[PDB]
Symmetry: C3
Subunit: 201 residues, 3 copies
Amino acid sequence: NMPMTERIRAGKLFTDMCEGLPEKRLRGKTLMYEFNHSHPSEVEKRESLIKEMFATVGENAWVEPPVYFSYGSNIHIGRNFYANFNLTIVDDYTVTIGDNVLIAPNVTLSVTGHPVHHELRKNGEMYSFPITIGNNVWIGSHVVINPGVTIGDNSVIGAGSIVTKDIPPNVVAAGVPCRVIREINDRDKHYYFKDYKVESS
Amino acid sequence: NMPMTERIRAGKLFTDMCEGLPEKRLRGKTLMYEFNHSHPSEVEKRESLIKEMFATVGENAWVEPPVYFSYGSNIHIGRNFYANFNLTIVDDYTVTIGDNVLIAPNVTLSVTGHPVHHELRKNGEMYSFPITIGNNVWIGSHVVINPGVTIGDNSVIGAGSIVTKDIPPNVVAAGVPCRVIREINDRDKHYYFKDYKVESS
Amino acid sequence: NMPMTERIRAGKLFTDMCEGLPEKRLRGKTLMYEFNHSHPSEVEKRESLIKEMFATVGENAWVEPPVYFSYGSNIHIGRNFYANFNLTIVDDYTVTIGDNVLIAPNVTLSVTGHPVHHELRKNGEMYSFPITIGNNVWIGSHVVINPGVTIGDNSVIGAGSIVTKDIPPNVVAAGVPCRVIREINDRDKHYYFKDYKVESS
Ligand SMILES: CC(C)(COP(=O)(O)OP(=O)(O)OC[C@H]1O[C@@H](n2cnc3c(N)ncnc32)[C@H](O)[C@@H]1OP(=O)(O)O)[C@@H](O)C(=O)NCCC(=O)NCCS
Ligand SMILES: CC(C)(COP(=O)(O)OP(=O)(O)OC[C@H]1O[C@@H](n2cnc3c(N)ncnc32)[C@H](O)[C@@H]1OP(=O)(O)O)[C@@H](O)C(=O)NCCC(=O)NCCS
Ligand SMILES: CC(C)(COP(=O)(O)OP(=O)(O)OC[C@H]1O[C@@H](n2cnc3c(N)ncnc32)[C@H](O)[C@@H]1OP(=O)(O)O)[C@@H](O)C(=O)NCCC(=O)NCCS
Ligand SMILES: O=[N+]([O-])c1ccc(O[C@@H]2O[C@H](CO)[C@H](O)[C@H](O)[C@H]2O)cc1
Ligand SMILES: O=[N+]([O-])c1ccc(O[C@@H]2O[C@H](CO)[C@H](O)[C@H](O)[C@H]2O)cc1
Ligand SMILES: O=[N+]([O-])c1ccc(O[C@@H]2O[C@H](CO)[C@H](O)[C@H](O)[C@H]2O)cc1
């Protein structure tokens, strides 16, 4: 009728116990395990590992272990990427991160959800909607980005926010659920934290 | 007068550095360590490890390591249980999980609390009130379930909510503190996510 | 002109890929790794490990692994300190915890933040502001403490609150963002949980 991997790209409900899906997760979870168990001095091994576990990684990437994901091969990353401890990405489908992105500790990305009505999820049915993170975005600690959410370039997501809707570019959004609190103006070019200014030359 | 293990069941303040409580945690914490450090392929080992660490597990159970708990012998799970990375269960007392429950990444269940007045908790004193999760319950990412809470059947707990009170069955609840936002009606039988419908068969 | 480490203490923007900073992070991430991968029965090793990785530790301390930090040597802890699973402390600068402090599972402390304007953080520039936690402080699960924050003695930070502002002593604070909800009175000396009193004798 309609293979399982096609329902995924169509945004329809599906299950993932076939078509080599399980085998893919294994290869992935395997690489992830090597990475999470590598010694802090195994810098080279860690470097090539990330290049192999993610679908696409730009130059100057650095991920602080542990890192958790479903396949890993559905995650595409740009340049100068940086993620602190416990980054979790549920990538049953595509996850794209722009350039110069910064992710604080314990952040969680999920393109997958489950039908709310217990009827549609009897067999653990799920749906997947890609997540797009712009360039020069900065995610706070303990943030949670839900399915099909887009974060516009240059935005900032406060610590602890639950993002369930796209966030426009050039704004500071935060809250549960996440909401735009204000746009990044030129004052932000002088004041970097509370009452701290930054002199020009 | 009244032994420590009896205060626990009576919901009174207690400490746990005696009566074998320490020993119990050591056995539990040992199996947990073997589980968490287990290679992705060690599927059979993993399957028996969970059977030996939880007081009760039903058929078709799956727990994505790492998992964290205090004893593991105070956790009782039904059938077709599924939990993602970093589930954490502080089980100084009973925690009962129903049938076909789904647990997203980084969730924390805790039956233990500390008295608010620093006086009463001079020695780390604590109290424990059992948590009960109904059947077909779906818990979002980064949720926190507090002592004595009861989640009714078929309910959904949005991502990031702090549940501090009983959640009735058949509702979608969320927020900090978690509040019921709506009852699950028949429209949810048709619309699974946002504007996505699902044709009959 | 003005060395990177001096800007840190001055609270100016800085980057840390020099002046042995990276090297320092390695020694720390090394001890940290030994700690997190240590077997539950390695009680003595665990104990000398926490003495060696933190700047200062008071007697009767206990940290349930895993534990995550940046350097570890900028962290100062008092007496009878207890931390549950997954405590994250980003310590690019001083972090001070007082006496009899209780931290629940999955808490994140960070003295570092990034300038909101993508121009100032083109190179991942950062700023660090020391965190100070009073005596007899109990932090609930999944809380996040942002830079420069100060929590007064005897206070309780409810589960899931994001602390962006100083919390006065003797208060129950909670919320996103954390807000004072009430003062700890004398009723808190009789009632410990909901409707549970404690017979003085
Ligand atoms: C977003 C952030 C950078 C600053 O936002 P800002 O506009 O410059 O700061 P403000 O104080 O002016 O914020 C305005 C209001 O939003 C609130 N607020 C701040 N951060 C918030 C957050 N994460 N969630 C919800 N509300 C938040 C403030 O309490 C303030 O309250 P008020 O309106 O009653 O006065 C900071 O709040 C933050 O959370 N940073 C993430 C830090 C982190 O996770 N670091 C980890 C190491 S990289
Ligand atoms: C709860 C959920 C399933 C959908 O709830 P729903 O009723 O079908 O969705 P709605 O958009 O109609 O929600 C209504 C409002 O609540 C808000 N809301 C949604 N999720 C929320 C959450 N987790 N916390 C707080 N508020 C939330 C919405 O932003 C919306 O705002 P509005 O009233 O201003 O329009 C979804 O929000 C969610 O969080 N799912 C968890 C996903 C997850 O953790 N997946 C991990 C992989 S299994
Ligand atoms: C803070 C705490 C100790 C109790 O606060 P309290 O004043 O004694 O309790 P109350 O029920 O009177 O709280 C008053 C209100 O705040 C709300 N509230 C409680 N905890 C909250 C939290 N963490 N965040 C936001 N709101 C919260 C309550 O729902 C209540 O609602 P109402 O005004 O509509 O009635 C408890 O809520 C808590 O979260 N403890 C942390 C537990 C934990 O993380 N344990 C891990 C193992 S150590
Ligand atoms: O409970 N079930 O029956 C059930 C069985 C398999 C499931 O698949 C799993 O879901 C995870 C998110 O929650 C990830 O998407 C993971 O990659 C996927 O295999 C989800 C639920
Ligand atoms: O800080 N103390 O003195 C102190 C000493 C021992 C404590 O016991 C511990 O608490 C944990 C939750 O926070 C779990 O309940 C764990 O099983 C219990 O042994 C809690 C606090
Ligand atoms: O993205 N960058 O270019 C970049 C490079 C190095 C950075 O340093 C790191 O930041 C962490 C918090 O997010 C901790 O402060 C850590 O100790 C620090 O070395 C932060 C960002």
